[PDB]
Design a protein around this ligand. Sequence first.
Ligand SMILES: [Mg+2]
Ligand SMILES: [Zn+2]
Ligand SMILES: [Zn+2]
Lengths: 1337, 99, 90
Amino acid sequence: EFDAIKIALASPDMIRSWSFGEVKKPETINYRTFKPERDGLFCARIFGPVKDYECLCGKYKRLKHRGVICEKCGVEVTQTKVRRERMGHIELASPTAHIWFLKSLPSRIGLLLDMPLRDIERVLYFESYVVIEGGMTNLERQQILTEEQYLDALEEFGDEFDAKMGAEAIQALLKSMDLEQECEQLREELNETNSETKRKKLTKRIKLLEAFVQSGNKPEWMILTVLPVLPPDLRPLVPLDGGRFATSDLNDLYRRVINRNNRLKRLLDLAAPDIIVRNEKRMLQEAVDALLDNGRRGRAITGSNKRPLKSLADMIKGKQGRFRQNLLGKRVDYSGRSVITVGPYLRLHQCGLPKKMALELFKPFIYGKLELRGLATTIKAAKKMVEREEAVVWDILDEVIREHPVLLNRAPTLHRLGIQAFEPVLIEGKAIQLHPLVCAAYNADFDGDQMAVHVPLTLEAQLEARALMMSTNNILSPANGEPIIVPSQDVVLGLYYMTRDCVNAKGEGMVLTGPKEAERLYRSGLASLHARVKVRITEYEKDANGELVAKTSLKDTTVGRAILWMIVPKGLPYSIVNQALGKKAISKMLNTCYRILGLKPTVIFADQIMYTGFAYAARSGASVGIDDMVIPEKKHEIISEAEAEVAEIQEQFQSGLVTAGERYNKVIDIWAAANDRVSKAMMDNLQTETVINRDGQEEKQVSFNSIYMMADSGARGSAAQIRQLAGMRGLMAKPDGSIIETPITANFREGLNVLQYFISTHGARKGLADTALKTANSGYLTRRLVDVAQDLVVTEDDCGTHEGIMMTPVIEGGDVKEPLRDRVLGRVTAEDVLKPGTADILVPRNTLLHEQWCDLLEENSVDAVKVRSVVSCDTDFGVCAHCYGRDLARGHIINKGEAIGVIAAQSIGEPGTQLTMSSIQVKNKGSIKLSNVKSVVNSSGKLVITSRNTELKLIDEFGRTKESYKVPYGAVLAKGDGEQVAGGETVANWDPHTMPVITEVSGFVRFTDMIDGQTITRQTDELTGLSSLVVLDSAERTAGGKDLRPALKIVDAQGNDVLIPGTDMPAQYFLPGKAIVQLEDGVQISSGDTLARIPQTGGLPRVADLFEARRPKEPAILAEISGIVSFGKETKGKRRLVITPVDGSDPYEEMIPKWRQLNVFEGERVERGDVISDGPEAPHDILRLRGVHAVTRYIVNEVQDVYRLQGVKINDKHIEVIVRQMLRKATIVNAGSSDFLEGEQVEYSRVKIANRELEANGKVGATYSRDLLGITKASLATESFISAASFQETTRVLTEAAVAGKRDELRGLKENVIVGRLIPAGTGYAYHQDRMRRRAA
Amino acid sequence: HARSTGSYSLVTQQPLGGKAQFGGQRFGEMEVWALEAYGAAYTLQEMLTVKSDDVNGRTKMYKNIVDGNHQMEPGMPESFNVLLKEIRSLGINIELEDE
Amino acid sequence: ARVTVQDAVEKIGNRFDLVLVAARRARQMQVGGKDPLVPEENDKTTVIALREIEEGLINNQILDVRERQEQQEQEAAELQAVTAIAEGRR
DNA sequence: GTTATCCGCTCACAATGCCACACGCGCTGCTCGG
DNA sequence: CCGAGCAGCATACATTACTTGTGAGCGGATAAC
Ligand SMILES: [Mg+2]
Ligand SMILES: [Zn+2]
Ligand SMILES: [Zn+2]
């Protein structure tokens, strides 16, 4: 019916057009006769008839009169439904402002009039005056007046001077203003003046005026004159059991406003006492403002119920506003919920369903089937039959769902798997059985967690659920290519018990003709479930692609493993079972089965695993008793010894032999050491206490204790929890975060004193409060996420670009925290990555890096590869297939249509519930690389470092990078480049609080204004007696040395300045403040000598601030361009600092906070993008300096560190698309032949296609700077508005998109969701491409 | 408890909420994001319009599914028309574009 | 017997187009029901369509050409009938 | 002095989802009334 | 003479109430020509 949405202001004529009449009386319904009072807020004459197809007075009562209006009461007898549609209007007795365009920063009227908002508010509410048209008097058209000035000018001028006050004054002021005239005036003016703050405000204003005159809007419409009142049915006076009709607050506000209007009109008729009508118009303005928004201007509280009233805006914004309450997520009538039990018998795609719930849900299908078999001719007969549940209705129901899928959902649906599709199976009771594996996928325990059901009723939806969201399709998380179907517990225990080996168990030493023989031998009670035997086994293989050879071997194994072998489906070799088969082993087996055999045998194999695991777990009878957890017989001794240690340490302290802080440190250290001792002793006594004997003396073996069998198998709980249970509970943490001296020497099996329990409670409550807050915080985070990437749909199949990122294995300095294999697994190469031997292309330029190519790369051991990321794809309004790469949760490349944005947001936000809230020591061998290093050789054969971007790297034998540290300015080098060193050797150490003035050219040194008393303070080293000088800068001392500047001239051995080796610029070594110089005047300098020495979150909020990209506290300032450093005038607001370019000009003398430490010298030639005052690098500056690849690398590395700190893994594609989103905005630099302004903020896509179209012609394009907004502000500044409307603001975006007439083309997920049509993402992508290829020609 | 059909909210033609009111479950924001994460376009569409709103559309779906035909005739959810009328009740003019 | 859709998505290298064409064929076999080619096992029309897909005898082109053949037969028959009526009215 | 510059001041504007249950929902002295 | 509806009332006042975290417009101090 449409393909777009237009929004703008409403002219009074338009509003009066909408209405079917004018409400005049405030009272709504007479109570002695429940009828809409005539010409009231519910009047039938104005809105519609109450009874369906019946006159109000009762005259006409039949469909024979559809259309006529009565004459006793005058109502148009039609369908009552129309009362849901018809609107009313109120002819306001005097103009009044519109509270939105007055108090929505920036106020539309304010910018439209160049008048400060305070004066506008003071003139709207009748407490000022405004002269208009600027008559013969010296009064400007925008000037305001108070009382005395107004009356004095009135005495001085009786005419030609029109000082009106109030709303209608502003209306006249607007309607008198010429739009395009002032527009072109400011246009011609903007190219005239300075600075850029005035130019910024003025370009904002001319943008407003141009958007205004462009759209059909007219400024006088911004002041309401006829207020449209909502249809009655949408504000229904809901009744109670008697006549206590609950007055919806909208009717209250409307009654207040219409009452003010009626009273004001009556006053206007009775000779109008001037001040009285003044105050009355003020009151009416106030009431209308309250109706449009109860927020500003105080409140409008209902009677005796101290709470504000829901205004109109209050019915749109917020969690109860129509957007987040009824439009985006609407309640469904065709579903149900219950509590979930286990039901561990059903197959992987099935799911339990209570007879009651199915009989209630599928009721229409049952009616249809009954009508088919004719068992009930009428529908009411079928309803009766279902009501009685005849013995045939159950057969019918069982028939009607034989393949009909169903949807199961968990309450917090963090990620995509929160809703899955199953086939229902009828059961008894009221619980909802579901497979245990998927309940590990839902993050669903059985603590009473409820689940909702849904029935897809149309054929498309049935087949869609069967094809897409059926459990046998989702077996890999869209976040990581790991398998989501992981046998969690109670089966890993079962299989682990089934695969072990008692050294002497009944049946050991036999030979079995096959697995079935072992199974029979076991069930008959002749051989233990796990005893070493010799079993013949026929493991199949695939020698050639497709074949299945058989190699009947005779392997030494155990009965349990042989029994389990009856489940592997003619694929995997025997080595996948022969091991102890813990939990990680089970995940590995399932993974390799999905890798070799495909999918269907893998799901059958997983179900068989689950069945046999539960079976033999039950048959095992694993049971934890009190005597299972053992205490090592040294724990008492170890604790007593550590007690003696801490006692003598404390005595030493009170004996005055150690400071209290270091004493605390020693105490906590010996306590942690004793804790580790007890833990190791407990482990070594528990895991091997089983010392059994076979045909003789004794043998050890891994324990058979129930505990540590639930642990070694990884079934439940780690060794850290075991030692916290049997062994010592260890140290505990104070509420602040500090650690108590005395730890919990006890353990759970033994008793716990009151104090120990108290401290444990400290810790536990800390954890619980953290969870209770992080849940809500992560919810808000993921909600913000999904509303900034909800547009991304993979449309193009190949953007055809060449720019990617240089993916390289991360190295935090220690080991490689992440190799290149996983960071590049499944992502198409941007460039044809060739092996280190050049001229031989290893991989073509558009290869999907599936696993075998990653194997090849590992073989040739490539350092880094360029890859086609998403942040560089060239798709208009989307992203191409290749630039997204491997479709995680599947194997192939992505299919055109998958809404990568939403799944990325979900994958990022799901683990949010698991977040929180001097020397160099090489390790391996290999060459020693030093990148971007300007250093000088001292008088000791070393290499002292003289630059800031010197990066040390340890390279292994394969030429690939292994370690990387950041050697700062002023470090010593025990070795040079190409020096094979062994680990641990301290190749570099430095005093952190020394920023030396080491020289790169030796000789002598002379002084330029290095004088004591005034500039410098001389003091003796009272320890020894050397005449040290504390050289103060201009800032350090008083003003007596502002102009006086030190300069250590690097002079020849006679006292004259020589140049620098390589160039002709000598070293004028200036000084920073607090310079403790030792080398007296004229003393020889050796190249590289210290001429002076001067000293110097973490969880969900971290990633939050990172995605918002908000400027951190005192960010690390960088250099805009290159050149030589030079200070300026102190206290220029901030101290001056310029960087002279190599050849260009330096028009900027940037201001820097003088107080905060400045890391740069004055004789340094600082390349752009270098640390000036260390700290966090704000992402804005990062982008604006080093392009987009720098900022995307930085953000992905930071967030990925944050996640890897918690053990969760997230593939970088998702954060990549997110950063691609939060920098889709752009700013314009020049103007060019394009119709774009200078400072106008435009979308990178639109400006890029405009440049493309202009380059199609001969004209020039406009240069652009990629912007970068926080996810929230980026989403708010979206091309479409309805998305941005519903997301977070829906009171500014509406005003703006209205006053500009931003016709919203839907072309997006959330928009189409709101409208209710299909989505451009799913099969709806096929639908929409068919449409835009046919409907739009 | 489950809900096939029944009453509906009068201000917004949606099914009521609550076991007592015989209402049905609420398909929430995160539920919609999940549903559209999969390519479940048609499922999300029918769960939006014809299940909960488009009173004519849902009566048509009922009458058409008792007749053994699982095809939907969707439309405009009356909640959206309610939003239209609320905005239009403000000074803002919002329309459905002709084409 | 449908537990997976991998064979289907192999015959149509996209799950989206897969479910689209399969829903089209199922609508064919459910209203104005064309007889299901593969012998059904007393199953719903959905899995019947999926089976006919994965067996390798239903796809986009086959459905379109069958629709066109139906159009041709229908138009030929009705035009013969209308010409007969045209002679009957003279 | 002025013109542009900047820094603290005050205000707007967001706070996970569901489920369930419970409770309540003007009034009041002036006004219409016999 | 009090019972039954009504019209516009922060009950008239001092109601009131610590940090929430962040952005953004704004007004008084500030560097420069
Ligand atoms: Mg739970
Ligand atoms: Zn009448
Ligand atoms: Zn691309």
